[PDB]
Structures are given as C-alpha cells and as structure tokens.
Amino acid sequence: CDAFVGTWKLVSSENFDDYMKEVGVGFATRKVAGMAKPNMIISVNGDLVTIRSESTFKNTEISFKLGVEFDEITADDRKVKSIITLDGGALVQVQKWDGKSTTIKRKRDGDKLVVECVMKGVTSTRVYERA
Amino acid sequence: CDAFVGTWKLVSSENFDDYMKEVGVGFATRKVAGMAKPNMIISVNGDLVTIRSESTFKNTEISFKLGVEFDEITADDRKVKSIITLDGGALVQVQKWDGKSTTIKRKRDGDKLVVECVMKGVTSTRVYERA
Question: Could you say which protein family the record assigns here (chains A, B)?
Fold first, then answer.
C-alpha cells in the first residue's frame, strides 16, 4: 500500500542463492537470477496492487487483491498459488506449490524496502532503496 | 609430488558453495566450510603422499600411494573410495560413494596451486599461494 509505492533498486542481498537452492532452482537459472539484480515497481489502483520486477533476464508482474488467492508464475517458472495480506504494516506473501510453501515478507525499514524470503529455515534478505 | 610439497594458503574461490550443493552438503556445513578457508599442507615420504587441510572447523588428512584405491572420510563426512594418480603433472583424484563420483584436480599454475572440483557439470576453482 502507500508506503510501498514507487520504483526500488536493489542495494544488497544476503543468502539469496541459498534460498533459491532450497526452492529447487537449477544452477543456470540461479546464476542468471543472481546476476540480474531486478528493480521492483509497486503501484496501487483501486483495490488492486501490482508488483513488477524488471531485469534483462525476465520481467515478472503480479496484480492482486490483498486476501484473495491467485495464480502466479515465478521468475524461475514455478506455477504457484499465492496469497498476500497486510499485517503489521508489512505485505506477507505465502506461495504454495506441490505440497511445499515459502513466505516472502516485504516491509519498510527506515527509508528502505526489505524483502525477506524463507524456505525451510533458510532466510534470504534483500534491501532496496528508492530509484 | 615435488612441485606440490609445502604449505599453501587459500587466495580465492569460485563456485565452491555451488559445488558443495551438488555434492549434497547441507546448509550449516556449507556455511562453516565456506567460512573456514583451510590451509593445504602436502608432504611426501617414500611412496606415500600426505595431503592435510587445517582449519578451525575441521582438520582432514589423507595418506596414499598414487594408483592405489583407499578409504577417505571427507570434511563434510562422506565416507568415499578415492584414487589419486599423477597425470600430465597434475594430481587427479576421483572419489566414488553411493553410485556417484566427483573429480578433484590439483595442478600448478605459475607460482600457485589450483584445485578444481567437478560434480556433474558444476566446477569450483580454488587458488592457493605458498604460505
């Protein structure tokens, strides 16, 4: 929502390759993804929130209503069911596929946007600043 | 053999966490191993070559005759069958366990010692200089 709207550029990443390993992403896609460093663009229109990621490798885009489950195809090409809710001022996303699940939390920290992704006890943290 | 004897200290590493992932090493051991940066000490006595790795985490040591298969327990605790031969001036090691195999090549490059480890198309390169 409002505090999230804008274009954000990646400043740092911790354990992202390890998170992708746990999600089962293959070596080549982990390599392209780790080189890509995508921007994040968030915008809101009525009750629909859009989150777009743009890079040379892949652009992704999801538009959703908070609290309504929807189909998402991830950058690493998983087809998942996602639900995003607003809790404690953070956007909390749960993605479920093949009996597995991962949580992606997007939260404000100071003037930054922090994305935390958790897959079975492995946590990755990516920090973004406004472009 | 002679060009290999001495104590060597790690200068750089490329793709080692990715190699350990392919060998099936778990997150915590990959983390301790990636932090450890072990020295390598090689010595020869008669027809027995000893290669020792020393770190805060684990010290490992193998003594072997070139061309004779032997039992090795790796730093990540796999129990493997190893054979090391001298080919083209490089020590070439093959480790086999549970129907899998990986090759570790130790070769001189200039004044450096280069260790290349290959597991199903993922290659890691570590470069050492004399201590």
Answer: Belongs to the calycin superfamily. Fatty-acid binding protein (FABP) family.
